[PDB]
Each structure stands twice: as structure tokens, then as C-alpha cells.
Amino acid sequence: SNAMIDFACKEFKVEDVIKCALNLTKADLNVMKSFLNEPDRWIDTDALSKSLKLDVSTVQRSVKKLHEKEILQRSQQNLDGGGYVYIYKIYSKNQIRNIIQKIVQSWADRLGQELKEWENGGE
Amino acid sequence: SNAMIDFACKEFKVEDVIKCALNLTKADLNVMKSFLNEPDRWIDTDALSKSLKLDVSTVQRSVKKLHEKEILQRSQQNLDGGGYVYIYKIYSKNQIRNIIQKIVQSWADRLGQELKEWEN
Numbered sequence: 001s002n003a004m005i006d007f008a009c010k011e012f013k014v015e016d017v018i019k020c021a022l023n024l025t026k027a028d029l030n031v032m033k034s035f036l037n038e039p040d041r042w043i044d045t046d047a048l049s050k051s052l053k054l055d056v057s058t059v060q061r062s063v064k065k066l067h068e069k070e071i072l073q074r075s076q077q078n079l080d081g082g083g084y085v086y087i088y089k090i091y092s093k094n095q096i097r098n099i100i101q102k103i104v105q106s107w108a109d110r111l112g113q114e115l116k117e118w119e120n121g122g123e
Numbered sequence: 124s125n126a127m128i129d130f131a132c133k134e135f136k137v138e139d140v141i142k143c144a145l146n147l148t149k150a151d152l153n154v155m156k157s158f159l160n161e162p163d164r165w166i167d168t169d170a171l172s173k174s175l176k177l178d179v180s181t182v183q184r185s186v187k188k189l190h191e192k193e194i195l196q197r198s199q200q201n202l203d204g205g206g207y208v209y210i211y212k213i214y215s216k217n218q219i220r221n222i223i224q225k226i227v228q229s230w231a232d233r234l235g236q237e238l239k240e241w242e243n
Contacts, residue, residue, distance in 0.1 A: 005237045007230050009143035020132035101235055108231040112224055114128050118137055122124045
């Protein structure tokens, strides 16, 4: 996007907000964007490392985190010699909305609790 | 209360967050504070201007804005000459929090919209 939003009378880049919520680096986000840009594909980290201009190790790191954060579905392509290579597919735009909103919601709850230590402690 | 909070990875003074929510200047906030300090006292605008060391006209605008926002209830004190002056009391402390939370919630609900429109 690069679009803009205003929360509590301060200016937010929407993607900074998404990086906050999901604890993403620039790179993790660009990896997430890569999946989002081809929603239906099953891609691997070797392919993706070529797809972007990045060392497999950092691509593996983003992809592991996203999988752990339930942004990414993970399957297996079994190989001729008996091994496997993990492949990933981004979940719907909607399984994900719920992840992010759960997180925004909790921010609102915490700010909530902090405000009532304001009154009872404000003297 | 001079305290800092973080929301969406940025730092806010909590009181700046209250000023934002309730749309208050600094005088406004100091007037609201007096009422929170005395949740039972009913007070008039003149007597409050004094205790706060602000000109009556300012106190007047704050108090009106807070009544408007249902932060304050209003009543009348009769005067010998047939007149009156408005007196004010700080609502339920559960009112205050519920008002601020519905607002903070609405900020949350809306930042939502701005995501259900980040790729669409």
C-alpha cells in the first residue's frame, strides 16, 4: 500500500502497523508480499530465494516465522531420492485479517487497562 | 499521569491519549482533573476559575465542552435575586472509562477497515 492511517492523533504507515502486529522485518514483509502477489502458488524457499534477490537463509527465516504465526500453510513435495522439500501457500486474505485484528484488539484492551491506572493513581 | 504507553509500536503520553480521545486542550484536561479529584463536589464556574488560577472565561468553555461530552452533569444553584449559576459534578467513574474505551475501540475498529482494504 504505502497508504496512511491515523490512530490516537498520530500518523501511521499501514505497513508499519502490520509489521508491528506480526513482528515482521522489511524482508519478512516482502516475503509475505511475495506470497500475496501469487495467492494460489505453492512455492519453496529455494524458488523464492531466486524469485527475490535474497540468501536462502533469510528467506527460510521469514518463512519459518510466518508458518509459526499461521500466515502460511506448509506442505511437502517428496523427492526421487527419498527426501522432501517443504512448500508453502499463503492462507486467505481473511484467515489473516482475523489474526491481525485479534492483535489490534489486544492493543486496545491493554491501553484500556492502562487508562484505569490513570484515574486510580492520578490522585 | 506523566506515564508513557506504546500503541502499535509508538510511544504516547497516556494523557495525550486522553486529550485526543476527548478532544481536550490542556486547560480542559486540568479542569476535568479537578472533578476527578472531587468526584462528589458540585462546583460553579467562578469558584473553579479561582482554585485553578485561570480566567473564568476559559473555565467556562472547558466546563461547557465537558458537560457536552457527558463527562459532567449540570445542575442549578438559586441566587437571592431570582437568578442562578450552573454547578457541575463529575459523572460515575465508570461513565468516564466507558466513554474513553468506546472511543479507543472505535479507533481499533476503524484501523481494521484500513486493512480490509490493504489488498482490496
